[PDB]
């Protein structure tokens, strides 16, 4: 988020590439998500990469 | 209650179906809570204890 207060830290800005109305075209979009649904990507090393 | 004003956005994924998610919590971020009167709760725990 900002980090700081634990109640704010949790608001993870989460950017990703999603399929557009045309299947060939792809758009980079972000969705605000918080805590548990966002899981550190398996086999990464404390990186910015996460999984659902 | 949940105090923070939260905006909403949607994303079209492929044809038809849209996906919904929070755009950004638009206010300040305060805690989420449940108020309960103490009086009535301490009256309850003892009344249950009696029975």
């Amino acid at each position, epitope marked *: 988020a*900002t980090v*700081k*207060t634990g109640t704010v830290e949790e608001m993870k800005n989460c950017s990703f590439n999603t399929t557009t109305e045309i299947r060939d075209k792809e758009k980079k979009e972000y969705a605000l998500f918080y805590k548990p649904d966002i899981v550190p990507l398996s086999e990464t090393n404390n990186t910015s990469e996460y999984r659902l | 209650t949940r*105090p923070n004003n939260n905006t909403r956005k949607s994303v079209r994924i492929g044809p038809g179906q849209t996906f919904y998610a929070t755009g950004d919590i*638009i206010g*300040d*971020i*305060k*805690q989420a809570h449940c108020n309960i009167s103490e009086e009535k709760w301490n009256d309850t725990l003892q009344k249950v204890g009696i029975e």
Partner: antibody
Amino acid sequence: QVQLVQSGAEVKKPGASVKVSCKASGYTFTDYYIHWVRQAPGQGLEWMGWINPNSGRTNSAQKFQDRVTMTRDTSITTASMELSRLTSDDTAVYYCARGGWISLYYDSSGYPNFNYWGQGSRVTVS
Amino acid sequence: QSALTQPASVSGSPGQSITISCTGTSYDVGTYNLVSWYQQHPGKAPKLMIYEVSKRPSGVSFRFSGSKSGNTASLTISGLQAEDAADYYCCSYAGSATVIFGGGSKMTVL
């Protein structure tokens, strides 16, 4: 009693930036929001938003849109504004003022309750 | 999204009750009781005169009152004094964690 102490006067060239700041004293600043206003010498006041001293989070007023950014340093009870690309239109007295109480469970950032004000500071753009 | 509209100036006799009005929109007020009033002697930072539409702050005497109605609100000053020659301003919650500052009105005295 509650003090809000500002810097002295300053003058800048167009396109320049200025830091405007204030020190809180006589109470604990961590418990309140700090808001900022401007008053041009012939006008009413313009409002700039609140900085939560603890979080360092803020909301910017309409017609600024990051033209001005705000920061804080809790170790010295000091609030600051960083005002960029100054135009002659920006000449005004800048004031530091204390807003409502802050608490973790309910939002109280919009409250127009400015009980304590600083001395004001002159910002001239020449 | 404009400033609260206020009379440029108002006036009256010593002892006279003066009411100062401020106008906005239903989004600005109907939704909120987040209304306050300030006054300032020229050359000085403003004093808060009213909290929560009509509540006197400590330090504000029982001369000052107020109310809200529809898209407007007002301050009532009983007992007009020469000393009231100060600017008066409204301000209120704009919504979306931002604050409206009013245009202001000047007190002049007779």
